[PDB]
Design a protein around this ligand. Sequence first.
Ligand SMILES: Nc1ncnc2c1ncn2[C@@H]1O[C@H](COP(=O)(O)OP(=O)(O)O)[C@@H](O)[C@H]1O
Ligand SMILES: [Mg+2]
Lengths: 82, 88, 446, 93, 96, 102, 108, 93, 95
Amino acid sequence: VLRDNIQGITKPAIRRLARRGGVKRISGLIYEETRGVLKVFLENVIRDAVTYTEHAKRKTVTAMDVVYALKRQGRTLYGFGG
Amino acid sequence: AKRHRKVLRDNIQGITKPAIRRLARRGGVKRISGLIYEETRGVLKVFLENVIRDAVTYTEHAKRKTVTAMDVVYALKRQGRTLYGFGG
Amino acid sequence: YVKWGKLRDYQVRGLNWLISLYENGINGILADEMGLGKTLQTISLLGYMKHYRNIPGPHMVLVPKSTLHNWMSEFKRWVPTLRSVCLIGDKEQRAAFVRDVLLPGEWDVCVTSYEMLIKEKSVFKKFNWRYLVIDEAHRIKNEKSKLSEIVREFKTTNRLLLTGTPLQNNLHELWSLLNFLLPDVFNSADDFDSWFRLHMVLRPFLLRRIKADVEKSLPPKKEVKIYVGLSKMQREWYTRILMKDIDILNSAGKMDKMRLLNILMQLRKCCNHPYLFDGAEPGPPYTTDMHLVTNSGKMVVLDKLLPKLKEQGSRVLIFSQMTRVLDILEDYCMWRNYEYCRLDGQTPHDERQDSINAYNEPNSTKFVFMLSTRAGGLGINLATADVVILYDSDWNPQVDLQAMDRAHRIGQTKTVRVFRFITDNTVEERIVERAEMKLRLDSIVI
Amino acid sequence: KTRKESYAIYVYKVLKQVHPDTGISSKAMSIMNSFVNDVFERIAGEASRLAHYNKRSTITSREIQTAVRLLLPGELAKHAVSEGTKAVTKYTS
Amino acid sequence: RKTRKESYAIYVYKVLKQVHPDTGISSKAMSIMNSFVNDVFERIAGEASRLAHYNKRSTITSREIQTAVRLLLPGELAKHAVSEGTKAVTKYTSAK
Amino acid sequence: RAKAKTRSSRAGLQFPVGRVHRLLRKGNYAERVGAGAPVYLAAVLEYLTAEILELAGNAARDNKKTRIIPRHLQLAVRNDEELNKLLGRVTIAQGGVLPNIQ
Amino acid sequence: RAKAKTRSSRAGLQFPVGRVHRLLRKGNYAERVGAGAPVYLAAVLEYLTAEILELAGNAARDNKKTRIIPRHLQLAVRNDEELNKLLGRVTIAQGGVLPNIQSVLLPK
Amino acid sequence: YRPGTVALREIRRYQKSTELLIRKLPFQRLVREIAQDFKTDLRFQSSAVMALQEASEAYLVALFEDTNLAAIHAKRVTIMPKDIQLARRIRGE
Amino acid sequence: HRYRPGTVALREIRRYQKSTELLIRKLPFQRLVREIAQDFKTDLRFQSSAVMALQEASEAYLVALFEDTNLAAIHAKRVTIMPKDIQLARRIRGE
DNA sequence: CTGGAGAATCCCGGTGCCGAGGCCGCTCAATTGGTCGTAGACAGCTCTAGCACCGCTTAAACGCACGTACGCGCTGTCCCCCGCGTTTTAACCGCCAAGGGGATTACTCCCTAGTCTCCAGGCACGTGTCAGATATATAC
DNA sequence: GTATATATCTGACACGTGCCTGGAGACTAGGGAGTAATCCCCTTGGCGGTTAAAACGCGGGGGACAGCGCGTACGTGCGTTTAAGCGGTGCTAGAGCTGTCTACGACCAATTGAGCGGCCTCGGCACCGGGATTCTCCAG
Ligand SMILES: Nc1ncnc2c1ncn2[C@@H]1O[C@H](COP(=O)(O)OP(=O)(O)O)[C@@H](O)[C@H]1O
Ligand SMILES: [Mg+2]
C-alpha cells in the first residue's frame, strides 16, 4: 500500500508550472493550496477512468479510458488515440 | 411644433438605469458606479445577438416565418444556458 | 314638468312609447336618427318617475367621456327638479366623492364614464338601481368585452339603451344588445340568428324615426366626393412600400430596412402624407413653410379653405382617423394663420366642453374644427358649422355617418355639405368600397 | 385534434405519496416535466456512447447502471443504483 | 492475425502536399490531425442528428449538414466552408 | 388471452415502463434495447422525482402554502449540495435567488 | 460491368466519401442518410484540414525546419481568432503556451 | 435615512421576490431590432419573447454576483466597469 | 555579482514559455496516480501512455489556472500571487 | 549619468542515427447493378393568433438639488520572499526475467425485433370551489 | 396604539366526463452475445551505475500593507413629466392539418482495386564542442 506521494510534487516543480503561466512572484502558501487543487482534479478524472475499465471487465487502465474521462469533463485532449 | 413634440430614443436606452439597478440589487450589489449603465447595455446586446442568431437559424431550417418558444429553448440549450418552464 | 322649452311633438310621442315599456315590463332600445334630441327625452323619463310615479330610486346613466358636461347641463336646464351627481377624477378624488357624496344617498341619478365604472365597480355593485340607461351602446357590441360583463352584474329594475346607430357589423352584435336588455327574450346568439322577417322582431322593442319625416324644416345634406392623385414623394414611397425596399435608417448602418409586417396600414399612412413616414421630410432643419401643401395631394386640394373663409362664414370641419395627420393640419393652419380648434383622446375632460362652446357661440371667430372620429365624433353637438371635409375614410360605415351628423342636428338651418378626400387608384379606394358594402345590409331602415 | 403527451400524471401520483396534503401549480408542473426530459436525455446519451466504445449492439441495464454512476453525484448515485436494482429484481420475479 | 486500424493519415498527407509541396509531418503531429478530424466529424454529425428530430424527419441530408455547419463554425470559417461543400455537391451531381 | 397488467405494476413503480421503452427505441441510441433497461431507467427517474418533491413540499410548508410553486422548487434545489451539482447549469423560470448578502 | 470511379473523384475531393458514408450509417445519427450528405461533409473536413496545415507549414518555415511537429500546430491555432474559437476547449499534447507576459510585470 | 440604509432594504426585497425587473414593451422592441439584421420580417410568439427575457435577466443577475466578488477582492464596495471585464475574462467569454 | 530580485524570474518565464517538455518529474507522478487509484479499485495495472495522458492533462490544467490567478492579483494591485487569488479564480470559473 | 566587466544565450561547423518516406505484397471494404417499398414534396383547405391603429389610467421614470460615504494618491513601515552556493539524495539511463492478462478465433444457443391483433390507460374536454389575494370591517 | 387581522371575492386547480390509439398478448425469426481456449504483447520489479535535480542554509531589498488626508461623485428625496400597462377593433399572415403521388435510399449479390501492414535506409536534424555579440549590472 502506497504512503503519501503528494509531497513528491516538489516546490521547484510547482514553481516551473507557475512560470509557464506567466507568474513573476509566488507566496509561500501557494504550494499546500496547489497540491490539494491537483489532488481534487486527479480524483475526479481517475474515478471515471476506472468506471470505464470496470464496465469493460479489464484490470488494466488504458489511454482511451483516460481520454474518455477527460472528454466528459469538458477537457478534450488530442494526441492519445482520441 | 405639433408635428414634433415627441422624440424617440434608441431601443437600447429602453433598458433604463432604474431597470439595471434592481438587477444588481437582486445580485446583492450595494453601491454602483456611473459608467456601468453603458457597459451593461453593451454586454446584454452581445448576449441577445448570440441567442437570436441561432434561434433564427432553426426557424429558417423549418421554413417558418414565426420565431417560436422552442426555437429559443434549443438555442439556449446548445450554448449551455438550459431553461426550464417553456416546454421541452 | 319640463321647464326651459317645450318638446317637439315626436319627442312627446317618444315618452309615451317609453313609459308604456315600464308598464309593459319590457326594456328595448330607442333609435332616432343621430342628433334628433334623444337626451332630453330620457331626462323627461327620469322626471316622470319623480313627479308622477314618485319613484326617486337611484338610476344610472353611462355616457362617453366627452358628453359628461353636456349630460349634466341638459339635466339642469330642462328638468332642474331631479338632483344628479357625476363621477370623474383621479384615485383620490374618486374616493372622496364616494365617501362624502355617493354613499350618503343624497341624489337620485349617477352619471359616469364607462371607464370610471370598471375602475370602481364594487361601490356601484353595493347599491340597488332602478333604471340603467346607457347612451352610445355600441361600446358593448361584443358579448365578451370586460365592460359588457361588469354592466350585466349590477342589480336593476328596468333598462334602456339609446343608440343612434342600431346596426354596426353583423347580426351577432344585435343579439348582444338584445340580451343585455331582455336576457329572457333572447337566450342565445344562435337562436336569434338563423331564425332571422325584417321589422317583425324589431317592432315591439325598437322605435326608429328619421329626421326627414319628423323635422321637415331641416335643410337636406349634400354628398360630394373629391378624388385626388398622389404627389411625387408619395408615388416613390408608395412604390417602395410595396416593394419592401424602403431602406431608410436614421442611425447610418447603410439605411438598414424598415419592417413592414402589415402592408395595408403603411400605404394608408402615406396616402395621407409622406411626412408621416420618417426621413421623407427634407433635411435636418425642416421649417419649410410651403413644401407641405405641395407634397400631399389631399393637402393641395385643401386650398379650398381660403375660398370658404372669404365665401361668407360657412364654417367647416376636418375629421380624421389618425393623430399624426391632425398634427400636420395644425402646423399648416398656423402658417396660413386661420382660426382653429382641436379635440383628441389625449385631451383633458375639462377642456373638451370649453372648446365645444367657444366654437358654438353665436358669433365666434373660429372657422375650422379638427376632430378625431373616435374621441370627438360621438355624442358632442357642434351645429354652428355648415361644411364637412373628411380627410380619411373608415372601414365601418357607421363610424363615418356619425361624424357627419355632429353638425346636422336640430338647429341647423344651412345645408350641411359633405366632402371626402379619396385617392382614385389606390387601396384607399378599396377601404371606401368596403365600408359601402356593409351599409347596404343596413339601408337606413324606416 | 392533436394530443400532447407529458409526465404530469406520474409526477402527481408521486407527489401524493410524498406529501398527501399538498397540491402543485401549473407553472411548477411544467418545470417538473422539463426536469424528467432533461435527465432522460443525459442517461441515454452516456449509455449509447458506452456501448459504442465497447463495440456492442445493445443497450442493457448494465450500461444504464454505469451511466447513472458517471452522471449523478455520490450520495444520489448510491441510492439511484439501489432503486434500479430493486426494481429489476422484482420485475424479473 | 494482427487486425487493421483505420486513420485519416494518407488523406492528411495528400492535402499537405497540395498546400506545401516540400514540407513533412512527424508521427505525433499526425496523431493530433487524426484526432482533430474525428472531433469535428462527431460535432457536425451530432447537431445534424438533432435538427432532424426537432423537425420530425428520419433522413439526414445536405440541408441538415449545411445548417449544422452554420451553427457550429465561427463566422468567416462558416462562409468559406459552406461554399466548398455546395461546390462539391454541384460537381458530384453532374457526374453521378 | 390473459387480462393485461402494466409492466410498471410488475416492477412496482409509478412512472411508465412502456413509454420509456418506446422513447429509447425511437431515439436512435442503440440498434437494440434490452428488457431490463426501461425498468432500471423508470426506477431512477421516479427516485429523482421524489427527492425534489420532498424538499419542495417542505419549502412550501415552511412558507405556510399548500401548493408548490416555482420558487419553492428553486429553494429546494439550491439548498441541497447534490441537486445543485446535478442542476448547476439550468435556469428555473420564476425561480428567485437564494437570499445572501456578503 | 463498367470500370469503377471512387465517389471522391466524382466530387473532386481528396478525403474519402465512401468511408464517411459508412461511418454515418453505422453511427446512430439517423434512420436514413442521403447520398449528397457524405459529399458535403467530406468537402468541409478537407477544407478545415487544409486551413490548419497551411498555417502550420508557415510556422515550420518560420522556425527554419522542414517537418511539421506538434508545437507548430499549437502556434497556428492559438494565433488565429476563429480556429482558437473552434478549438477553445482543447489541449494539444506537446503543445507549449504562446509566449506572453502581462506588461505590469516587465521592468521599468 | 443614511447613505446605504435604503440600498440594503431594496436588496432584501428584490431577493425575496421572483418577478421580472425590466419593462416588457421596451425589451420587446429591442429583440425585434436585433433580429431584423439576421433575417427580415419575422413575426414572433408571445411566449418566445418571455423565454428571452427570463434567460436575459438570469444571465445579468448571475454576472452581477461575480462582479461583486471581484470588487470586494480589490477591497472596494462600489462595482466598476473593470470588475465586469475580469469576471467575463475568467469565465472565458 | 548577483542579479536583482525578479530578473531571473523573467528568464525562467521566457525559457519555460518556449519549451514543450513536461515539468513535473515522471516517476514521482506515477506513484501519486497509483495511490489515488487504490481508493476506487485494488490491483489495477496501467498502460504507460495512460500515465502520460494523465500528466499532459494535469500540467495543462495547472498552467491555465495560474494564468487566471495572476490576473486576479494584478486586479488587486499586487504582483505576488496569494491563496485567495486561486480561490477567487476557481469560484468565478464555477469549480 | 554611464564605462566597464563578465556571465547569457546566441551562430557556427563536425560529428553520427534511428525517424520518415519509399516500396513490396495482398488483404477485404468500395464499387456497380438491380430491385424493393415508403420518406417526404406538393397542393389544398381551414381558422388561430399575430400585427396595426386608437383609448384609458396612473405607476413609473425623468431631472433637479442637496450632502457626506468612501474612491484612491503618498507615505512609512519591516517582514519573506529571491538568489546564491553548498551538500545532498534519488532521478535517469541501461541491462535482463517472469508471467499477468490483451488479444485472437472458435463454438454454441439466449436474446430481442418483427408481425398482427387487441381493448384500457391517457388525452382533451367542461365545470366548481377553493387557495390565495386582497377586500371589509374591527379592535384595543 | 396601529398593522396586522379580521374579513371577501375569484381565476386556477381539481374533479369527473366522454372519447379513442398506444400499450400489451403471444408466438417465430435469426442474428448478437456469451464463454473456451489459444497465443505471446507488454507489464511488473531485479540490479548497478551516476549523472542531474532537489535540498539545505541564509544575505539582503523587493513588494505587501496600514494609515492618513483630500476631494467629487453616488445616493438621497423632491416635484415633475412621461409613456408602461391595460381595454377595444380592425384585419388577414401564415401555423396547422389532411390528402395525394412518385423520387429516393436501403438492400442484395457480385465484383475487383484502394488501402493495409510489413519490411527498408539514405537524409532530417539531435548532439557535442569551437567562438560571437550582447544581455545586465555596478563603481566609479
Ligand atoms: N324640444 C327641443 N327644443 C329645442 N331644442 C332641442 C329640443 N330637443 C333637442 N334640442 C336640441 O337639439 C340637440 C339634440 O341633440 P342631443 O340631445 O345630443 O340628441 P342625441 O343624443 O340624439 O344626439 C341638443 O343640442 C338640444 O339642445
Ligand atoms: Mg348626446
